[PDB]
Structure 1
């Protein structure tokens, strides 16, 4: 069976198709044209993009496929190193860090982070309470202030103080610029060409900034001896039950860098898409606002109250369905195997899972896949296995899933309790790609309900 393949460019094969500032959205369009699987070739490499639950349920069989580092992740590894996100499953430091960190990310571990999440959420609510009448909110900008600050504080007892700034912090300026370089390197022939000497110079300097700050945080905390019980504490003290070993300080640095990138970016995207969909669907916004008012009966939300925001959780899942903010992941075949009864693969062959396309599979979701309908998630158990994968798969799934969802549920609950929202520009969705996805230029107005904190 000849696997479908999109248009080619002579000796460059399919590579120029990714020479665009919206590559995921381009791949989605190709998937619409070509169906559940297509081959994608560039000089010296091939992968296959999967979009159906029928095929993806096979790819998610951990006995048959393991996480691969995409080229994107290999480039991110230059600064995220052998942190959890950019490590191979077979690296000693993956299993050690996994075993050590997993407990501290449980739905139950969120009880300890809740107060610090509220600290940052209240800063956001106060910002918006303090806007004057004519003024508006830059949504992804403020969500990114929130989610960065939340992972910084809950995770490392460090305050980025993003709500005190227009200029986003020297660590973050570097981190953003590092991510940008990694992204550009993808659509770039002859890496060692003298032209990119300046790009390499900046890259190295940004790594230095990120490492300096973080190693200092580490060493201050070690020296100080003062004990929170936060993520960094867990790491400095905790031992892997299997090997009996702790993480070394360098790996700890890589984990912190990873959490700061991983631990905020996709979360700000989620919140921004959720608020986008709410203002475009006023009946949904009203139902969610009713729940927030009924449940959040105290000035400060409790942990248990956040767990009771069932409909707000449905809204977030439906936002993740339509626009999963980490929109792909990569696998390789552990052994020769046949995909879908039709497509033979050799050991080592790669697959890409195109999550937004999976989440539009009409055999799973019905014909109305573009509609925003939180009620799809009335009972999340009703969704078939491997149909909904915004947090990846298996032992390599997102370690931060419960953290992200607790934070997003708390913040969105507070926003809906405290304000009415207006889509005053009738905003036209424009999704910016930086590996991750966000609605660029999304702005709203928020009129206070005048409920005291």
Structure 2
């Protein structure tokens, strides 16, 4: 027995998620019913933890294990058995994990950084070419940056998203697919032909995505191959344990997975970091100073971008306030007892609200809402289990260091070359396409005319 929102007859607790912002509404519900409230759609039942005292127990890997949320299962139609959408028990998870983790080591990050240059630059000089009347769309440009970055770094493919003014075809099809997956949780009945058009769209969109994967495999095969991208490790790499590589199906699924998960979250992070820095003009200066004093060169090396640090505080704080991956699901291997008086049968599903967890007064204090980059000056103070926006344990985000290195590079370059002034009095708008992203975020940045 647990508090739960009102039950609508045979439809149960499902129809409360009937809005464009389902994840954002679950926070408002959690503040009411408490740290956990049971949620019950037809058949499926979940529980949403909002306080660390219980989330820490859910995160013990011997007790509980990552579960695919009702949304991630719908994602499986194009993501397949990739790292994000594969069960930990499917041999593909551990196989691909051990195969692809070497690509995110410290030594491979140095090789990726020079490729990150191309696209961070490729954003900076785009903004240097803009005239005084034009405002710049931060989410739309951050998505371009991040997608180009993951393409060129991990798959040696240039999306050239800055050379198109409207989103890349892959981006439109992907947002359609994620929007559809979020809308499928909605549908009391997805079986009715009333959504048949959606199905026709899904395959269609997937086509585009799949087609792009073809372009990434077709070129490298015929390409002059002198690079060790993530793609070479997918095609030619072998698993230490299995002893055998990935099958074609899972290779394509991993390519799709990394495109989506490598650009969406990171672009949302850059957009939120800006929103809070542009909203608070008094946080910029130090950071700016930092870049200017930390970057002796206009184009930096991995030692220089590793030497900059305060950007880490600024950026980490955006995820603490608004993580671009809002939640993850877990399940119970055995009939353990959670948080004291909570007992769970085998396979009971558990969701955790990363934003609401991070929005806990006991650990972070009463002033949770405040955007404070101060908190992260020390890594040691916060308990490990309280704050984690990249997942938990072995199922934590595999490309965390990649994401953060890219984000600091881009954000610090922005603050180094430009002066940002909020000229739109933006009201907060958080679009949910399986992920959290500021919607309509528009700012303009007067250049600092700093040469290369």
CA deviation after TM superposition for structure 1 residue 205, in Å? 2.1
CA deviation after TM superposition for structure 1 residue 223, in Å? 4.2
Distance in 2, matches of 1:438 and 1:235, equals 30
Question: CA deviation digits over 1:173-200, x for unaligned, max 9?
Answer: 3222222221211101222211122211
8 Å contact kept, 2:101–2:398: yes
| Alpha-carbon spacing, 1:246–1:225, altered in 2? closer, same or farther (3 Å) | farther
CA deviation after TM superposition for structure 1 residue 210, in Å? 2.0
Distance in 2, matches of 1:43 and 1:380, equals 43
CA deviation after TM superposition for structure 1 residue 65, in Å? 0.7
Residue 231 (str. 1) matches residue 233 (str. 2): no
Question: CA deviation digits over 1:354-394, x for unaligned, max 9?
Answer: 00011011111011100011110011222102111110111
Distance in 2, matches of 1:302 and 1:372, equals 30
SS in 2 for 1:143: helix
CA deviation after TM superposition for structure 1 residue 42, in Å? 1.7
8 Å contact kept, 1:218–1:249: no
8 Å contact kept, 1:140–1:438: yes
Distance in 2, matches of 1:277 and 1:315, equals 9
CA deviation after TM superposition for structure 1 residue 439, in Å? 1.0
| Alpha-carbon spacing, 1:250–1:216, altered in 2? closer, same or farther (3 Å) | farther
Question: After alignment, is 209-218 or 127-136 more displaced?
Answer: 209-218
Distance in 2, matches of 1:166 and 1:153, equals 19
Q: Which runs of 4+ in 1 moved over 4 A?
A: none
Distance in 2, matches of 1:407 and 1:214, equals 23
Query: When the two structures are superposed, what TM-score results if normalisation uses the length of structure 1?
Result: 0.97
Q: How many residues align?
A: 452
8 Å contact kept, 1:107–1:403: no
Distance in 2, matches of 1:275 and 1:107, equals 27
Distance in 2, matches of 1:11 and 1:250, equals 39
Unaligned runs of 5+ in 1: none
SS in 1 for 2:107: coil
CA deviation after TM superposition for structure 1 residue 60, in Å? 0.4
Matched with 1:383 is 382
Query: When the two structures are superposed, what TM-score results if normalisation uses the length of structure 2?
Result: 0.98
Unaligned runs of 5+ in 2: none
SS in 2 for 1:381: coil
SS in 1 for 2:329: strand
8 Å contact kept, 1:266–1:326: yes
| Alpha-carbon spacing, 1:170–1:348, altered in 2? closer, same or farther (3 Å) | same
CA deviation after TM superposition for structure 1 residue 225, in Å? 5.8
SS in 2 for 1:380: coil
8 Å contact kept, 1:47–1:351: yes
8 Å contact kept, 1:65–1:333: yes
Question: After alignment, is 5-14 or 241-250 more displaced?
Answer: 5-14
Distance in 2, matches of 1:364 and 1:19, equals 32
CA deviation after TM superposition for structure 1 residue 90, in Å? 0.4
8 Å contact kept, 2:175–2:433: no
Question: CA deviation digits over 1:74-123, x for unaligned, max 9?
Answer: 01100010111000000011111000011111244211100111100001
CA deviation after TM superposition for structure 1 residue 253, in Å? 0.7
Distance in 1, matches of 2:307 and 2:359, equals 28
8 Å contact kept, 2:181–2:434: no
Matched with 1:322 is 321
8 Å contact kept, 2:288–2:415: yes
Matched with 2:77 is 78
8 Å contact kept, 1:321–1:390: yes
8 Å contact kept, 2:140–2:167: no
Question: After alignment, is 189-198 or 423-432 more displaced?
Answer: 189-198
CA deviation after TM superposition for structure 1 residue 299, in Å? 1.9
8 Å contact kept, 1:227–1:233: no
Question: CA deviation digits over 1:201-250, x for unaligned, max 9?
Answer: 12112222322331342243234462311110122221111111111222
Matched with 1:140 is 139
Distance in 1, matches of 2:17 and 2:74, equals 16
SS in 2 for 1:77: helix
Distance in 2, matches of 1:206 and 1:447, equals 38
Distance in 2, matches of 1:190 and 1:429, equals 32
Question: After alignment, is 275-284 or 405-414 more displaced?
Answer: 275-284
8 Å contact kept, 2:213–2:255: yes
Question: After alignment, is 240-249 or 165-174 more displaced?
Answer: 165-174
